[PDB]
Amino acid sequence: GSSGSSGDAFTDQKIRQRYADLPGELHIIELEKDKNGLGLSLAGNKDRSRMSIFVVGINPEGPAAADGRMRIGDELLEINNQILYGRSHQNASAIIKTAPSKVKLVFIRNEDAVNQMASGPSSG
Numbered sequence: 001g002s003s004g005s006s007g008d009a010f011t012d013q014k015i016r017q018r019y020a021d022l023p024g025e026l027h028i029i030e031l032e033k034d035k036n037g038l039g040l041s042l043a044g045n046k047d048r049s050r051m052s053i054f055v056v057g058i059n060p061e062g063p064a065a066a067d068g069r070m071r072i073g074d075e076l077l078e079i080n081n082q083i084l085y086g087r088s089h090q091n092a093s094a095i096i097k098t099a100p101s102k103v104k105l106v107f108i109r110n111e112d113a114v115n116q117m118a119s120g121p122s123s124g
Helices: 012-018 063-067 089-098
Strands: 025-032 040-043 053-058 102-109
Touching: 012 025, 025 063, 040 089
Parallel strands: none
Antiparallel strands: 025 102, 040 053
C-alpha cells in the first residue's frame, strides 16, 4: 500500500541526535548547486587514521559562497541522504555530482575543527 523501503534514520531529528554528541553545532543548510556546483575545498584529518571531511576553503564562485552560510572548519557528515563519515573526501564530491540541483548538506560547526583538519588539499 504505497509503501516500500522504509527507513526514517535520515530524519533531521535523528541527524541532530545522531551527531548531537559532537562538540561543534550541527548546521544543516540547503545549497542549490551552481553553474559548477557545490565548490568546497575538502581535506582529510591531520592523522590519516582519523577519517573526517573538513572545509579548508569555500569557492567564491560556488553556491556555498553565494549563500554565505558555510564556513571554514565545517565537518561534512551527510549529503543528499548519504553518510560520508568514514569515506574519503573524494567520494563526497562524487555524491554531490550525482545529486540534483538542490542538495541537503549536513555538517558541524566547531571552532576547534580548523585545528583538527589538515588544511592541505595538495591540488597544485
